[PDB]
Amino acid sequence: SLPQSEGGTNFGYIGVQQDKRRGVTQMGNTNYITEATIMRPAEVGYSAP
Amino acid sequence: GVGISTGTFNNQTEFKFLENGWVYITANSSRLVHLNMPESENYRRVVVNNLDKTAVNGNMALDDTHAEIVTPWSLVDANAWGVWFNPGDWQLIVNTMSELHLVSFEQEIFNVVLKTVSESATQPPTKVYNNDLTASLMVALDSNNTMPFTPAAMRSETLGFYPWKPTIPTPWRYYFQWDRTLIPSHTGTSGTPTNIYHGTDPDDVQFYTIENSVPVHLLRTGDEFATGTFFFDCKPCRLTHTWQTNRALGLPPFLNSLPQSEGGTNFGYIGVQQDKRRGVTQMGNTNYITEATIMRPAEVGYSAPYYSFEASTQGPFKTPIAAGRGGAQTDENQAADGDPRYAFGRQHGQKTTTTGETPERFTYIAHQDTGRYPEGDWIQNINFNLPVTDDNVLLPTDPIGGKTGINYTNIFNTYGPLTALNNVPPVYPNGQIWDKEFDTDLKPRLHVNAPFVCQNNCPGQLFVKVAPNLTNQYDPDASANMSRIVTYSDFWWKGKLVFKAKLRASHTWNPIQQMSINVDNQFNYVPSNIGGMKIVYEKSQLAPRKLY
Amino acid sequence: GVGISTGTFNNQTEFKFLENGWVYITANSSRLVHLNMPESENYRRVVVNNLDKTAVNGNMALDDTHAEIVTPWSLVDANAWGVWFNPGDWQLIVNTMSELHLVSFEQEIFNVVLKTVSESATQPPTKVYNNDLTASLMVALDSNNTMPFTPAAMRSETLGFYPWKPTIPTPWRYYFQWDRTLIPSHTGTSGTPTNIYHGTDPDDVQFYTIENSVPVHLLRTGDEFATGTFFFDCKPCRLTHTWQTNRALGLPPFLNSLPQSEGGTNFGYIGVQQDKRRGVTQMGNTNYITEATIMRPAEVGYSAPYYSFEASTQGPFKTPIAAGRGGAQTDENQAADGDPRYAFGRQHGQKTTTTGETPERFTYIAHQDTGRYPEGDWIQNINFNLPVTDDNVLLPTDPIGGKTGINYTNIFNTYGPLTALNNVPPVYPNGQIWDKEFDTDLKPRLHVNAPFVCQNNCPGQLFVKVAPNLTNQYDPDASANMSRIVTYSDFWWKGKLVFKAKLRASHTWNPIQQMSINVDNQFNYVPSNIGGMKIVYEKSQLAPRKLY
Amino acid sequence: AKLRASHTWNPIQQMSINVDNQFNYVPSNIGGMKIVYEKSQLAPRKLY
Ligand SMILES: [Mg+2]
Ligand SMILES: [Mg+2]
């Protein structure tokens, strides 16, 4: 779902239920595939004390 | 010209054996590819923002907020094992060979066809499809890797895995920069935790176009496009799993008392008091030397945070894990080992007769025992006065920060200069094959999506696009609709991926793990009463290795 | 032949660096071009005459009266900076390089397609477009420059500035001679001041046709046409602006008293009586030696009449102005300095989503401070008895010829043998790039529409036209007009423009003017939620130079 | 060092002056003067 007017809240939508999407995650439990869940090849940066 | 084919279909897989047991695996792959004209001939910056779900509190992990450039170009990605091998092939490779090198990759596009739909013609009223001979298909190969690398395997959007079933590319799209804050919360946190999309850091803006970076070729029916042959350079990938954890490295303790009848409780006994034993440990206090105490040369595998999420500039994201598997008999922390989970549809494995929007799934648990079972972790006090007091030990049962469902292992990390690791195993068939390396000054010791990483140069991405087939009325000065004849293309794609592998040898008295069928199992490898069919995930590192 | 492409899309911009910092900028450009058959296959002499607006009295400046030859040919003009560089390109050029030479220019036409409409088939009833394989596209290249020069940049009618957005040529037309008198007037003026179009000086009649002057190529689908490589010869265009006006040329006067605390009104003082000072002036009378008085080697810039209109054979026209900019902070008299003003549409910069026929506009105010601020002008009497009497000075306040709104600066002209000038700065993206030189025995020292002027010979203009696709009923002897099959063509255009530039170098302690983004501004360079998009005015001569 | 090249449609961050800023780079009424910290990695790259 792509927007059909310009503007600041005219968002686009992925358009598939979060638990029925196709793709790869490192979460053996859920079928949730979201931008925060989705696998990435590695990790950029690191957290330190 | 028109009536003259420009290529040959070949989905044949060749194994050429050489001397010193080197094999030369030539995987050929061919597909018919279908492509429609773009939704619009324009580039778009679109923002997705599900406050809809994130504002709920405790639904942070459901964040989909991002920005994206939607291009009128489509991507031909064949970067997945299933494009190149059928199961029988994978059987052969996996049971019989000890390592695997990635050598070369070439591909071409041929027998291009373009048809225009149009139209309402005629009798209740029907549609009819004609050839536009003079029409063109746009092809562009980003051989310089000018453009964002987007492996389609991650979204299970590669080419189809079946040679006799046609397939499609995917609309190309790439990340555009966005700032973003999303503050964590639980069901209880109320008030409204800040959950905002700030915009775009101008210092980070990069808008790419195919047109300005890559030479574009127009292919009519009689035209053909072929790439060079690209030669890879990466490490070898091994087809053997290691089974030893720290507890099985080196010289086991001599048993002074050996069993003297067969049976299931007829144990052997070390036969020396645990505090009167000889050996080396890193425990300066006690004179206890036991199998969990005894020194080992280094550490196999590592402990990592789970399910850890970290956040930078563009929002929160999961912390990735390398190892696995680590748990005993059929019990694993599929998160502490970060065992990857693949969701895919019909084109890539699901039963092709299955109706419904729900994807097929599985969780790959590697054979290589290098992970952790944090349930078994613990931490004692310096004094090692044992049996240990509750106050002198920290268990994976004791809550941390006063949360019932959180313990120390969730934040734990034992990566260190003594850490040993293997690379990820190939995940057949939905796995990625190779992946480009990060252009960072210091690089990851591996990637978790693919075993082959190109430090050199990687094959450029291949993009296709139906050329604008205009009608007679076109006014560019007009804001109004791009007026185009409905046009689409069929073209064939052939690729050649070459490996160089090495045959295994029997080093033990006992036999080993290998694929087969099986009275179970047997029905995942044949079609059905109707036109089948299914492709099943199936491991890769079946034979044991030997760490130490 | 039919199904075989005859060219390659390339809109790629290559920057190839050589020794001693000479760079070899090869700007490639490609567009898909759309073209309909002529409105009639005939040449027409049409006259325009707006007595409706000129007879108004006080409306002399609104004259549009002229004569014109309308040709069945269309013009493919690529003469505009926006055709060749995107902002990213332009940024590089302007910020890092000091001058710019024009080297070579070639173009070709390929993958021609001709389609016939016709239409009517069937039910509600809709229209349908088929390929005419045997149909031809006429292409003619006027390499001898036989025909009137019509740079389209002046009417914002060049090719599109977006690679992925198709475009069109513009209908060709040229000026045909006409005599014309129009007497100026104001609102108060009685009677009807004479306002007539007398007709056409037979001694000055020139009727040109493509057919009789230029070789014409017929291109069917499989044909292609390429021009040679044209090599320019011109002066360099500089990418640095000069900041010095007369008031800052040479040795500043010695300060005998320097301030001794920081601050905003802690000025320094020369410390010598203005009439007891040493130096050279061009004032034979006084012994006053001041900064506005002290001699300078010559004069930077010149004063010009504004808004001056002059009239010849064919009517009135504005007197054009060279220099600019001349005023201080944020106030510049955009007419005394003749700052140019650009109007353009969607294809060339205006937001492509904007509906309505109102064009986007801007006024280019150059960085090079070489203009005038006539409010600051004045003229003293020979005697220089000052403070000056009202009788001895002529101000830009004192009315001339008894008009409240007119002063001497409106007719003033200080061009002279001591005048120093720069050439016009490039106007990205709507500015013209190169321009033909007048075939007058004596030539202008510059042009205001473009920085590069071919005194050699300029590239020929390129003309296209759909060939007459006749129906079976055709009678040339017949007065009724030609019934032709409705035909149109899509063809691809590729051009290559090569520059040779030189890298600048830092010679000052301070940094300098350079383009960037910017939390403002940042959004003129990316598409939108829908298909974008916009190209914005962006200067050209950013880094300072030095006159003297 | 090595010269950069434009890879995007958009322009990018780069140093300049600036109606602000402009007075940190010239001396003063007296003998100036000041030198100001100023970053270094202005142009975008691309990780992946
Ligand atoms: Mg095991
Ligand atoms: Mg200035």
Instruction: Phi first, then psi: give them for residue B284, nearest 5 degrees.
Output: -60, -20
Which residue, chain included where needed, has tokens 């302007």? C94
B452-454 and B434-436 strand pairing: parallel
| H or E segment to which residue C84 belongs | helix C81-84
- C484 annotated to a ligand binding site: no
Question: Distances in Å between the alpha carbon of B439 and those of B68, B310, B313, C10, D46?
Answer: 21, 21, 19, 27, 7
Of D9, D45, D48, the CB nearest to B436: D48
Please indicate whether, in this complex, the C-beta atoms of C530 and A7 are within 8 angstroms of each other.
Answer: no
Size of interface B-C (CB pairs under 8 A): 167
Distance C324 CA to ligand 2 centre (A): 10
CB C320 within 8 A of CB C305: no
Distance B263 CA to ligand 1 centre (A): 24
CB C526 within 8 A of CB C222: no
- The three-point CA angle C409-C413-C416 to 5° equals 150
B137-142 and B22-36 strand pairing: unpaired
d(CA C41, CA C73): 9
C175 DSSP β-pair partners:
C68
**Which residues in B lie closer than 8 A to residue D6 (C-beta atoms)?**
none
Which residue, chain included where needed, has tokens 């092939």? B89
CB B287 within 8 A of CB B301: no
Amino acid identity for residue C134 in this structure: T
d(CA B441, CA C314): 69
> Across chain C, which distance is largest between two alpha carbons, in Å?
99
The C-alpha R_g of chain A, in whole angstroms, comes to: 15
**Which residues in D lie closer than 8 A to residue C88 (C-beta atoms)?**
6-12
| H or E segment to which residue C360 belongs | strand C360-363
Which residue, chain included where needed, has tokens 């964590």? B184
**Which residues in B lie closer than 8 A to residue C35 (C-beta atoms)?**
none
Of all ligands present, the nearest one to the C-alpha of C325 is: 2
Q: Which residue of B lies nearest to D6 if distances are taken between CA atoms?
A: B213
CB B306 within 8 A of CB B295: no
d(CA B501, CA C188): 99
d(CA C544, CA C56): 48
Please indicate whether, in this complex, the C-beta atoms of D10 and C263 are within 8 angstroms of each other.
Answer: no
Distance C504 CA to ligand 2 centre (A): 20
Where does residue B174 rank: exposed (0-12), middle (13-18), buried (19+ CB within 10 A)? Answer: middle
Which of B132, B217, B207 is CA-nearest to residue B174? B207
Of B72, B207, B216, the CB nearest to C526: B207
**Structure method:** X-ray
Which of B44, B131, B38, B73 is CA-nearest to residue B484? B38
CA B472 to chain centroid = 47
Please indicate whether, in this complex, the C-beta atoms of C530 and A6 are within 8 angstroms of each other.
Answer: yes
Q: How many CB atoms lie within 10 A of CB C61?
A: 12
DSSP assignment of B356-416 = SSPPEEEE---S------GGG--EE-TT--SSPPGGGEE-SSS-BTTBTT--GGGG-----
d(CA B71, CA C473): 48
Amino acid identity for residue D5 in this structure: A
**Which residues in C lie closer than 8 A to residue B215 (C-beta atoms)?**
8-10, 12
CB B32 within 8 A of CB B492: yes
**Which residues in C lie closer than 8 A to residue B214 (C-beta atoms)?**
12
Which of B507, B537, B519, B534 is CA-nearest to residue B98? B507
d(CA B238, CA B543): 10
Structural tokens at position C7 = 């060219």
Please indicate whether, in this complex, the C-beta atoms of D14 and C515 are within 8 angstroms of each other.
Answer: yes
- C341 annotated to a ligand binding site: no
Q: Which residue of A lies nearest to C351 if distances are taken between CA atoms?
A: A6
- C31 annotated to a ligand binding site: no
Instruction: Phi first, then psi: give them for residue C305, nearest 5 degrees.
Output: -65, 140
- The three-point CA angle B434-B440-B444 to 5° equals 55
Sign for the CA dihedral angle at C441, C443, C449, C451 comes to positive
Distance C368 CA to ligand 2 centre (A): 6
Of B40, B134, B476, the CB nearest to C221: B134
Instruction: Phi first, then psi: give them for residue C152, nearest 5 degrees.
Output: -85, -10
- The three-point CA angle C239-C245-C251 to 5° equals 110
Helical spans, DSSP H, in C374-484: none
* Residues sharing a CB contact under 8 Å with residue D38, sequence separation 6 or more, in sequence order: D15
CB B435 within 8 A of CB B123: no
Cis peptide bond N-terminal to C533, omega within 30 = yes
Which residues of A make CB contacts under 8 Å with B?
2-3, 11-14, 16-18, 20-29, 31-45, 47
Distance C251 CA to ligand 2 centre (A): 21
DSSP assignment of C186-222 = -TT--S---EEEEE--GGG-----HHHHS-EEEE-TT
d(CA C265, CA C376): 24
DSSP C293: T
Amino acid identity for residue B337 in this structure: D
- C520 annotated to a ligand binding site: no
d(CA C24, CA C1): 36
Distance B497 CA to ligand 2 centre (A): 61
| H or E segment to which residue B83 belongs | helix B81-84
Please indicate whether, in this complex, the C-beta atoms of B439 and D46 are within 8 angstroms of each other.
Answer: yes
Instruction: Phi first, then psi: give them for residue B3, nearest 5 degrees.
Output: -85, 30
**Which residues in B lie closer than 8 A to residue C122 (C-beta atoms)?**
120-122
Please indicate whether, in this complex, the C-beta atoms of C512 and D30 are within 8 angstroms of each other.
Answer: no
**Which residues in C lie closer than 8 A to residue D44 (C-beta atoms)?**
none
Of all ligands present, the nearest one to the C-alpha of B332 is: 1
DSSP helix, strand, coil percent of chain B (3-state; round to 5): 10, 30, 60
Structural tokens at position C423 = 């050439």
CB B159 within 8 A of CB B167: yes
Which residue, chain included where needed, has tokens 């008392």? B257
B352 DSSP β-pair partners:
none
CB C190 within 8 A of CB C76: no
Structural tokens at position B437 = 């390396």
Question: Distances in Å between the alpha carbon of B205 and those of B115, B179, B197, B199, C501?
Answer: 38, 11, 16, 11, 27
d(CA C159, CA C153): 9
In the annotated binding site of B for Mg(2+), the residues are 201, 204, 325, 369
User: Would residue C159 be called left, alpha or beta, if left means φ above 0 and alpha means ψ between -120 and 50 degrees?
Assistant: beta
Q: How many CB atoms lie within 10 A of CB C147?
A: 21
d(CA D8, CA C536): 16
d(CA B422, CA B433): 16
Helical spans, DSSP H, in C399-536: none
B225-226 and B97-116 strand pairing: antiparallel
Which of B458, B419, B415 is CA-nearest to residue B435? B458
DSSP assignment of D2-47 = ------SSS--------TTTTTSSS--SSS--------S--S----
Which of B350, B306, B359, B310 is CA-nearest to residue B332? B306
